Amino acid sequence: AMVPPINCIFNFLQQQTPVTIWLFEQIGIRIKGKIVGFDEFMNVVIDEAVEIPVEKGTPLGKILLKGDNITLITS
Amino acid sequence: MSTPAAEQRKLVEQLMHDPKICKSYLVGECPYDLFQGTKQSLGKCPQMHLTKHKIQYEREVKQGKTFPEFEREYLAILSRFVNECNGQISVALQNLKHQKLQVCEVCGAYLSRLDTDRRLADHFLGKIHLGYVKMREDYDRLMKNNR
Amino acid sequence: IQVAHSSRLANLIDYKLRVLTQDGRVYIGQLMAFDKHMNLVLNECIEERVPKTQLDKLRPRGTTLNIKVEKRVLGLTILRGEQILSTVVEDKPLLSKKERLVRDKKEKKQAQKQTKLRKEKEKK
Amino acid sequence: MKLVNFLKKLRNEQVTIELKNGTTVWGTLQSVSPQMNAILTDVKLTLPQPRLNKLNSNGIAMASLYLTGGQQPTASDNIASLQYINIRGNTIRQIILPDSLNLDSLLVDQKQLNSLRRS
Amino acid sequence: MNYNLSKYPDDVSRLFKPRPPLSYKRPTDYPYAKRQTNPNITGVANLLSTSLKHYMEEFPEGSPNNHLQRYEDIKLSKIKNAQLLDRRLQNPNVDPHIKDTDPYRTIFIGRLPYDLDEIELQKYFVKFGEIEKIRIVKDKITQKSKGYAFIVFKDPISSKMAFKEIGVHRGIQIKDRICIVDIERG
Amino acid sequence: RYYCEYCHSYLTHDTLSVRKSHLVGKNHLRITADYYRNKARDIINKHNHKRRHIGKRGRKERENSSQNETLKVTCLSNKEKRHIMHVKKMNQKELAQTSIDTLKLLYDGSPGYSKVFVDANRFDIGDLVKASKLPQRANEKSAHHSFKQTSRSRDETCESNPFPRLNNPKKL
Amino acid sequence: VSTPELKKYMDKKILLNINGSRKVAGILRGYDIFLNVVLDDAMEINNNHQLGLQTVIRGNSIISLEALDAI
Amino acid sequence: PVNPKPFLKGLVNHRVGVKLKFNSTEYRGTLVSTDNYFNLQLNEAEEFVAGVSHGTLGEIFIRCNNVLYIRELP
Amino acid sequence: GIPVKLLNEAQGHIVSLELTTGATYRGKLVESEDSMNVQLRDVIATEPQGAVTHMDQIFVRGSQIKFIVVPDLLKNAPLFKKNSSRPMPPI
Amino acid sequence: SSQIIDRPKHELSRAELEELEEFEFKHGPMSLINDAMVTRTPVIISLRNNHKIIARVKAFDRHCNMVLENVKELWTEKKGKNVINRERFISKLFLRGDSVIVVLKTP
RNA sequence: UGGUAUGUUC
RNA sequence: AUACUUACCUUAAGAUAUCAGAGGAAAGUCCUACUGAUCAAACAUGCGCUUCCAAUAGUAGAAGGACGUUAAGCAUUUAUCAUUGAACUAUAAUUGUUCAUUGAAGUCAUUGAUGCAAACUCCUUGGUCACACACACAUACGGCGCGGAAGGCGUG
Ligand SMILES: [Zn+2]
């Protein structure tokens, strides 16, 4: 059985499993948080978001993250 | 359909109890869906099918609170196609009765004994034969689970 | 070499082009085909590049600059249009415009004969 | 409104296309494609130095100018004078227009005016 | 090339013998991780205090957008023709000229000849019933006959057959034209 | 639509399955093989001349040619050159398919032979020869050829063939 | 448009270079038409630290995806 | 369970902070209206190239591709 | 268009392609797509700073390709012919 | 109005496409540029190569490409300690839309 | 009302 | 070749120069082997248009190559990281130096690479055309032989 990546992002939403989002480099932060809703374009909204430099980084509350930047969504 | 971004939106829009939900897709394979690709397609499935209901149903089976009248609904679907194609394979056996040919029930169509194993393997890997095979062993498995 | 003022990339089939890419590399070859995305097909295109060591002789100040240019030979390549930056024309085609016309009329004759034959053969 | 249909109207005028390298292309403009593929003819590619001594310039675009084949071998600055350049559209950053042309004749979209009269 | 992953036989696949392998040259661009446009895009607000004031002292008034003027002119002339249409619709009961007897007997005919007569079209309606009144409409600015006329007959059944005949037969033969016919509809 | 300029035939709306089925078809594959055989034959045997730009011979040149002599030209007949050019083309073809394979004959008993020379057990192209075989859908050709296949395994040790010379070999 | 031809790489270990430097190796569980890929038990090869139980990679950032198994 | 397009429709005429991907520049301001491409129009906006606030900005149109994230501010 | 169809002609022949990262790959072309995704087999892989290795198969996303070098006989392929006439397609 | 905004564009009729373009320019984010086109006020545009232009918009477009008059380009160049402010005046200019980052309407 | 493909029979 | 068996398919829409004027089926639509103006294409056809077209009265030369030799040319510069033991200098946990041991990777090259420059050998290409072996020219130079190549412009 295959799990397409829409299904994996939707399982991250449905179980609220906390994700680390690797943005693409030369920015140099990562977003930790929980996925509340995701787009067709892989925009995601994050509740209780933290940004981390590359584990002392700032909190953001709830953000909309544009999917052009995202490199990995890992748990 | 056209641009890839438009194609995904349909899938995600489809990701996001029985009045508007088909049961045959939700139990197993919807037999509307299985030979819709080939020529023997009756047509499109008239009741709506979603992936979100399939994930909810896998959640409901995994928790263990299964409800078997749904499976009785699905068995009521299977019996039509089983009896119709069983009549039709007996029509095929009557045509074969009334250059060596044999009739294969498990596709419901003609084969020859003269042809070799790899061409016959090609025919055995078909939309019609595999839709039939999932249909039939699912039917016999539901019947033996009833008995 | 002089090129016609109204010569688009569809006219310049079989001319020898000079395609420039984003990484500073020049591809030189006979043009075979092109596409909507502007990705070429070049027949005998030879890649050239300026090495980083030779490069500071290009910077603004002898009379003439002499740049040893690292060239590789590749043949019948297709480029990708995303990388192409601009194209310039280096050399005219082998055949003259009149002689190119003669060849095209000949080829039209031979092709029409062959499909006439294939039709009358499928009839019998 | 697409301004590419504005830009196609020019068709015989000395422009200066400033590309994303930093290289600027001055020349008589022939056609413009619907993806902004300018074809200029009597062009003079040049790469402006940054007037501060220590700052270098684009180095890749120096290589690109020399490799066009038109750099004058005695020349001090990076200029390359070449008949017929053809420019893929995504490269253009801005197009310096001539002083003389009247915008209020050219910017009238005939098709927008057409539908707006029709409806 | 000891082996063939292609569909062709060996002799055909030897014909597609490639060139020798490409030589290696050291790169002159940026490695893929180091590629970026400009970061440290500086802020826009510093301009707004100082540089904008020089710009406003230098160019105080913008040039007029005369290209939008033509779109607005066709829009306002559409609105103007709507207002004139409102006036012309403003100027039946006060019509008077067609205010002869009741509209049950009154047939209209249209696209009949401007250069026709009263008596020949009246006889044309008299073909299908007795005539009580007939009236051509001529333009009140200048008396070109408008090609429309109202004929009230002595009976509405005869006028119904007249409208049927003289409209349904492709518009009755006019002096030089096709005269459709129907009821008054006023 | 899809049109195969090798086969010269239109087909209905191309789906990757239908098109991929066509490109491995048998009729298509013999016609494509013929096409490139003919084009390689042409770019060998194209017999076409360079332009000859003929310069006016100097007088100082033309004295020394007057000394030497006319030299006789040998020219064959029509039938003779027909036969001899058939023969020469045949010689170039069989000299092109000639390959030297002696060193595989000489090492035929050596201890690590199967792993290097069988070419189906090699470690670089061992998987590729396995993938190269065919679908092999007509087994009637396989039953028509009644040889034994006689494959060499990789598991051979030097215990088999202890004394190679006991009538097992033939001379070079 | 058209889904990539990775039906033969399913459930096999695979090494792909994200961006130009990172190299992630995992078991391929699913793919999309953008070449998004989700692989279980990922690890980032440099010592090499594991990512997580289930990751997705945006195929915008994948260059090449060679397979470290049978196929 | 809130998706991104309803999230942006919900933030209409509400204070929001958008940070561009470049310099960690951020614009904090009230959201007037948003596109299908998520182009952003901000009113009474202030500019933060670091934590440092440089100024106040009247109305800004922020182009769709540059924004890293959009957050709702306290 | 013609260039993508030329890449489809080269299936089963040794092609060499240079990616946008700088890497070079030379191997058989097993499968190619309309998007230019290519799958090379028995591939010799040269990294940008020059190290060479051997890969059994590789799938490169076709967005990353700079150029592809196909065999040299394919200039005689029939899709380059200008004057060409079709057999009147069927229903 | 709202329903044409929510619907996917491949379904919409041709007149609905033209209607949506007018609607998004009138009541939208690009409406900002439109007001400065009509009220004839200068805008400050910040480009991707770290140049800032001050200009008036003569026309604009779906991709945010815009024809500008009285363009003034401001930029700064730095090596080490050293920094120079360079400024240039151009009369009429086309600006391709992909370079812009932020567009500000001057009060 | 079709196309390509496959293999059998003669 | 026929025939039969299966297996795989059986679709993005729309358009064909523009502007103005007259006519036909108050607003717009459609059309006119209608009429103006602009544009574009083909084909003829010209310009005192512009550039280029190789010795034989000689053994040459021009343009472009070499993935050619001299050639190991001449001048610079490169060839791992961690752990442990031993001697060792020392302001020093032993920073420096040498020898051995375990582990980790590791494109080949060092006759290489890079910088500079020269000679030589050889390939492809061309009107190797005709009349001439000539005292010209300030408005600086009869551009007043036949062709060919490539563009610029004009007319039909
Ligand atoms: Zn074919």
JSON list of N, CA and C (backbone and C1' of nucleotides) and ligand atoms in Angstrom, two decimals, chain F residues 2-9 11 22-23 28 31-32, chain K residues 4-5, ligand 1:
[
{"chain": "F", "resi": 2, "resn": "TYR", "atom": "N", "xyz": [-0.53, 10.42, -32.41]},
{"chain": "F", "resi": 2, "resn": "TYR", "atom": "CA", "xyz": [0.81, 9.89, -32.49]},
{"chain": "F", "resi": 2, "resn": "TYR", "atom": "C", "xyz": [0.99, 9.26, -33.85]},
{"chain": "F", "resi": 3, "resn": "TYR", "atom": "N", "xyz": [2.13, 9.56, -34.45]},
{"chain": "F", "resi": 3, "resn": "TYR", "atom": "CA", "xyz": [2.50, 9.11, -35.77]},
{"chain": "F", "resi": 3, "resn": "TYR", "atom": "C", "xyz": [3.94, 8.66, -35.73]},
{"chain": "F", "resi": 4, "resn": "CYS", "atom": "N", "xyz": [4.20, 7.47, -36.24]},
{"chain": "F", "resi": 4, "resn": "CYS", "atom": "CA", "xyz": [5.52, 6.87, -36.20]},
{"chain": "F", "resi": 4, "resn": "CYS", "atom": "C", "xyz": [6.14, 6.99, -37.57]},
{"chain": "F", "resi": 5, "resn": "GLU", "atom": "N", "xyz": [7.11, 7.89, -37.72]},
{"chain": "F", "resi": 5, "resn": "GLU", "atom": "CA", "xyz": [7.68, 8.15, -39.03]},
{"chain": "F", "resi": 5, "resn": "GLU", "atom": "C", "xyz": [8.52, 6.99, -39.53]},
{"chain": "F", "resi": 6, "resn": "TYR", "atom": "N", "xyz": [8.90, 6.08, -38.64]},
{"chain": "F", "resi": 6, "resn": "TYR", "atom": "CA", "xyz": [9.52, 4.86, -39.11]},
{"chain": "F", "resi": 6, "resn": "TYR", "atom": "C", "xyz": [8.48, 3.97, -39.74]},
{"chain": "F", "resi": 7, "resn": "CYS", "atom": "N", "xyz": [7.36, 3.77, -39.06]},
{"chain": "F", "resi": 7, "resn": "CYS", "atom": "CA", "xyz": [6.37, 2.82, -39.52]},
{"chain": "F", "resi": 7, "resn": "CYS", "atom": "C", "xyz": [5.41, 3.47, -40.51]},
{"chain": "F", "resi": 8, "resn": "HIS", "atom": "N", "xyz": [5.43, 4.80, -40.57]},
{"chain": "F", "resi": 8, "resn": "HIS", "atom": "CA", "xyz": [4.56, 5.66, -41.39]},
{"chain": "F", "resi": 8, "resn": "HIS", "atom": "C", "xyz": [3.09, 5.50, -41.04]},
{"chain": "F", "resi": 9, "resn": "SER", "atom": "N", "xyz": [2.76, 5.25, -39.78]},
{"chain": "F", "resi": 9, "resn": "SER", "atom": "CA", "xyz": [1.39, 4.92, -39.42]},
{"chain": "F", "resi": 9, "resn": "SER", "atom": "C", "xyz": [0.91, 5.77, -38.26]},
{"chain": "F", "resi": 11, "resn": "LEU", "atom": "N", "xyz": [-1.84, 6.46, -35.20]},
{"chain": "F", "resi": 11, "resn": "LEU", "atom": "CA", "xyz": [-2.65, 5.73, -34.25]},
{"chain": "F", "resi": 11, "resn": "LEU", "atom": "C", "xyz": [-3.57, 6.69, -33.51]},
{"chain": "F", "resi": 22, "resn": "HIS", "atom": "N", "xyz": [3.50, 0.24, -28.47]},
{"chain": "F", "resi": 22, "resn": "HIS", "atom": "CA", "xyz": [3.86, 0.33, -29.89]},
{"chain": "F", "resi": 22, "resn": "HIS", "atom": "C", "xyz": [5.35, 0.30, -30.11]},
{"chain": "F", "resi": 23, "resn": "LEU", "atom": "N", "xyz": [6.10, 1.01, -29.27]},
{"chain": "F", "resi": 23, "resn": "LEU", "atom": "CA", "xyz": [7.53, 1.19, -29.52]},
{"chain": "F", "resi": 23, "resn": "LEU", "atom": "C", "xyz": [8.32, -0.09, -29.32]},
{"chain": "F", "resi": 28, "resn": "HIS", "atom": "N", "xyz": [7.35, -2.75, -35.76]},
{"chain": "F", "resi": 28, "resn": "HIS", "atom": "CA", "xyz": [8.01, -1.47, -35.55]},
{"chain": "F", "resi": 28, "resn": "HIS", "atom": "C", "xyz": [9.50, -1.63, -35.37]},
{"chain": "F", "resi": 31, "resn": "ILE", "atom": "N", "xyz": [11.34, -2.45, -38.60]},
{"chain": "F", "resi": 31, "resn": "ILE", "atom": "CA", "xyz": [11.36, -1.29, -39.49]},
{"chain": "F", "resi": 31, "resn": "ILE", "atom": "C", "xyz": [12.33, -0.23, -39.00]},
{"chain": "F", "resi": 32, "resn": "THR", "atom": "N", "xyz": [12.43, -0.06, -37.68]},
{"chain": "F", "resi": 32, "resn": "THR", "atom": "CA", "xyz": [13.37, 0.92, -37.14]},
{"chain": "F", "resi": 32, "resn": "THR", "atom": "C", "xyz": [14.80, 0.47, -37.31]},
{"chain": "K", "resi": 4, "resn": "U", "atom": "P", "xyz": [-3.43, 0.37, -37.01]},
{"chain": "K", "resi": 4, "resn": "U", "atom": "O5'", "xyz": [-2.53, 0.11, -35.72]},
{"chain": "K", "resi": 4, "resn": "U", "atom": "C5'", "xyz": [-1.37, 0.88, -35.43]},
{"chain": "K", "resi": 4, "resn": "U", "atom": "C4'", "xyz": [-0.94, 0.69, -34.00]},
{"chain": "K", "resi": 4, "resn": "U", "atom": "C3'", "xyz": [-0.44, -0.69, -33.62]},
{"chain": "K", "resi": 4, "resn": "U", "atom": "O3'", "xyz": [0.90, -0.95, -33.99]},
{"chain": "K", "resi": 4, "resn": "U", "atom": "C1'", "xyz": [-1.95, 0.08, -31.98]},
{"chain": "K", "resi": 5, "resn": "A", "atom": "P", "xyz": [1.36, -2.45, -34.35]},
{"chain": "K", "resi": 5, "resn": "A", "atom": "O5'", "xyz": [1.25, -3.24, -32.98]},
{"chain": "K", "resi": 5, "resn": "A", "atom": "C5'", "xyz": [2.15, -2.98, -31.91]},
{"chain": "K", "resi": 5, "resn": "A", "atom": "C4'", "xyz": [1.70, -3.69, -30.65]},
{"chain": "K", "resi": 5, "resn": "A", "atom": "C3'", "xyz": [1.62, -5.20, -30.74]},
{"chain": "K", "resi": 5, "resn": "A", "atom": "O3'", "xyz": [2.87, -5.82, -30.54]},
{"chain": "K", "resi": 5, "resn": "A", "atom": "C1'", "xyz": [-0.38, -4.39, -29.84]},
{"chain": "M", "resi": 1, "resn": "ZN", "atom": "ZN", "xyz": [6.05, 2.93, -35.29]}
]
